[PDB]
């Protein structure tokens, strides 16, 4: 199963963008799975 991205806990926009992209990737792979 695809891993759940960690919440960056303060956090910079980059980490939010990464968290969002990783979350989207999680949803994509979770649906694919």
Which one, of 32, 17, 31, 29, lies nearest residue 3 by Cα? 29
Beta-carbon-side half-sphere exposure of residue 33 (alpha carbons within 13 Å): 9
8 phi, psi to nearest 5 deg? -70, 100
Residue 30 tokens, joined: 């979770």
What burial letters (b/e) apply to 6-22, b meaning 16+ CB within 10 Å? eeeeeeeeeeeeeeeee
Which CA distances in Å does 9 have to 12, 17, 30? 9, 14, 24
Which one, of 20, 21, 18, 23, lies nearest residue 4 by Cα? 23
Q: What domain count does the chain have?
A: 1
Domain that holds residue 30: 1-33
Experimental determination approach used: NMR
Which CA distances in Å does 1 have to 11, 16, 26, 27, 32? 27, 23, 10, 11, 10
């Amino acid at each position: 199963p695809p891993k759940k991205p960690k919440k960056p806990g303060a956090a910079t926009p980059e980490k939010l963008a990464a968290y969002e992209k990783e979350l989207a990737a999680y949803e994509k792979e979770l649906a694919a799975y």
